[PDB]
Amino acid sequence: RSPGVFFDSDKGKTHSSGKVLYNARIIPYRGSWLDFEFDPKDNLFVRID
């Protein structure tokens, strides 16, 4: 997977809601990953690696 930013969906299977989801993922060529993801409550979250 080429280093850069990548925006995904992950729709259907999450929590049945049909509300889908949206997540951004910043992948470097070296070092830690930076993730930003949503959730059923429409709150924005962040996880390192």
Partner 1 sequence: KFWATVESSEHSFEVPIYAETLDEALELAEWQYVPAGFEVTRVRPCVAPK
Number of residues this chain uses to bind partner 1 (CB under 8 A)? 3
Between CA 25 and CA 48 the distance in angstroms is 10
* Contact letters for partner 1, residues 6-35 (x by CB under 8 A): ---------xx-------------------
Identify whether the C-beta of residue 35 lies closer than 8 Å to the C-beta of residue 23: yes
Q: Is 43 in the site for partner 1 (CB under 8 A)?
A: no
- The pair of three-digit structure tokens given for residue 47, joined into one six-digit string: 């996880």
Query: What are the φ/ψ torsions at residue 23 (nearest 5 degrees)?
Result: -140, 140
Q: Is 40 in the site for partner 1 (CB under 8 A)?
A: yes
Which residues sit at the interface with partner 1, rule CB under 8 A? 15-16, 40
